[PDB]
Amino acid sequence: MTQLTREQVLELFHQRSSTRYYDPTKKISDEDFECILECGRLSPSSVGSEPWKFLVIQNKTLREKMKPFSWGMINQLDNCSHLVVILAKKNARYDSPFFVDVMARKGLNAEQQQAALAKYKALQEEDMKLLENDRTLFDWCSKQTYIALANMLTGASALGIDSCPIEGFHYDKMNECLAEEGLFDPQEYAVSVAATFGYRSRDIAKKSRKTLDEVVKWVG
Amino acid sequence: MTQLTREQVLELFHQRSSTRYYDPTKKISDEDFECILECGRLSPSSVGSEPWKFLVIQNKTLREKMKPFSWGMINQLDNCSHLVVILAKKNARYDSPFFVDVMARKGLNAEQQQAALAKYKALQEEDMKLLENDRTLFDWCSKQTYIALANMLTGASALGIDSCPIEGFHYDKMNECLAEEGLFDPQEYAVSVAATFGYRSRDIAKKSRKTLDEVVKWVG
Ligand SMILES: Cc1cc2nc3c(=O)[nH]c(=O)nc-3n(C[C@H](O)[C@H](O)[C@H](O)COP(=O)(O)O)c2cc1C
Ligand SMILES: Cc1cc2nc3c(=O)[nH]c(=O)nc-3n(C[C@H](O)[C@H](O)[C@H](O)COP(=O)(O)O)c2cc1C
């Protein structure tokens, strides 16, 4: 098993910073980048839903086409080693074909599936109130994809690989772009969040966070 | 700098599983659990919004009060060492006082603030269409808190401490419950997600995930 001291764990999450300036001469090995993607694939997700898809956008022409509506990463698109656009599943209702696969991956038998479907329905409809509209239910999947996002960042960091998480683009324009390019079915998926990966070309900014006393309330 | 091999990074995310059964005779040390909290505090977040608050629910009475509407952690409420209920910030509009503190942590002068506010309005109103209603704006904050959740699960795993993310509870009753105890302002925050921590009483269940070829689309 992988074990670290508190000092090592602190440094790992302290050393990961948002890299906005990448060295264009350095690329991540195929072995290293596969490892990053694995951090995403292995991430936990609510009821094992795994509602993500990781588009890896290495095509230079597609990257260029995104610049005019991707201000959050416009200078990173040229220089980063790798770009992942994470999609989230649309309409992941408890009764959709999508949850049939969720349960098959669990090896549920028919009676367990009936209980699981009741669980999912309760969670979605009553506990979490996700079935109000398409957007709330999509955002539930999206939340899960940010878990994958976070583990990919941390995993990149552990490998000595710099990253930047990315929201700064027009989402309608991004969805239209990528869907028009044939990269996903827009009725089935939509863009959730993005992230660049590479090796920094400039200095990383000092961490700036709220204090621990500001963000924690102990209820003893 | 903390550095891991590819194999160690994989094992970090294979060894972490959702712990349903905690040994009640085993407690996380105060130092270890502060380290876990630091993983969440140091997490990245969109425009550095850090829109989380971490409620550490150690009180036994209060844990017991939560049991009847928290089916997703019924046995865990009793046996786990530590419980965190993560809140996300409500109504985190670009022009809110919440964002006055966001810019202040970034040391922005007056000119930098008017540019940042213009960037925040663009992101919320046009790019991400977060201002449709209160819930879409909340769910944006909630997505950031799932990064902090992920990093606390991962940091715990590197310390050798087991965890389980928790959505399985009635959100309306839990909001009502924690607010009634006077633990947060329901008009400023709402419950996002929860997580248990401690030491597992059973061996790790093998991962079941979609394959890498199923979740990755390479666009060369
Ligand atoms: C956001 C979220 C909420 C979850 N809620 C619960 C819960 O309430 N009860 C539970 O036992 N597991 C919960 N889990 C754990 C998942 O069921 C689990 O991650 C999935 O089945 C994969 O198993 P693994 O994490 O052990 O690989 C949740 C996971 C996530 C990411
Ligand atoms: C979901 C999300 C989206 C982000 N989008 C952007 C982006 O579009 N452009 C950018 O340069 N930074 C982006 N960031 C990075 C944050 O601005 C950054 O994490 C924070 O301001 C500074 O902290 P750090 O360097 O400690 O990560 C984003 C971060 C997250 C979590």
Author numbering:
A (entry chain A), B (entry chain B): 1 to 220
What text does the study give?
To understand better how variation in the substrate-binding site mediates activity, we solved the crystal structures of the NfsB homologs from Hi KW20, Hi Int1, Hi 86-028NP, and Nm Z2491. The Hi Int1 and Hi 86-028NP enzymes showed comparable, although statistically significant, kinetics (q < 0.05) to Hi KW20 NfsB. The relative increase in resistance conferred by H. influenzae or Neisseria nfsB expression ranged from approximately a 16-fold increase (Hi KW20 and Hi 86-028NP) down to an ∼2-fold increase (Hi Int1 and Hi 12). The divergence in chloramphenicol resistance and in vitro activity likely reflect the vagaries of heterologous expression in Es. coli and suggest the presence of important subtleties that still need to be accounted for when estimating mobilization risks of cryptic and proto-resistance genes. This is especially evident with the NfsB enzymes from Hi KW20 and Hi Int1. Intuitively, the Ser68-Met74 pair found in Hi 12 NfsB would provide more of the flexibility needed to properly locate and orient Trp71 to make space for the ribose of NADP than the Pro68-Ile74 pair in other H. influenzae NfsB homologs (Pro68-Ala74 in Nm Z2491 NfsB).
Phylogenetically diverse bacteria can carry out chloramphenicol reduction, but only a single enzyme has been described that efficiently catalyzes this reaction, the NfsB nitroreductase from Haemophilus influenzae strain KW20. We found that expression of H. influenzae and Neisseria spp. nfsB genes, but not Pasteurella multocida nfsB, allows Escherichia coli to resist chloramphenicol by nitroreduction. Mass spectrometric analysis confirmed that purified H. influenzae and N. meningitides NfsB enzymes reduce chloramphenicol to amino-chloramphenicol, while kinetics analyses supported the hypothesis that chloramphenicol reduction is a secondary activity. Previous kinetic studies of nitroreductase catalysis revealed that reactions progress by a double-displacement (ping-pong) mechanism that appears to lack the gating steps necessary to impose specificity, explaining the substrate promiscuity of these enzymes.
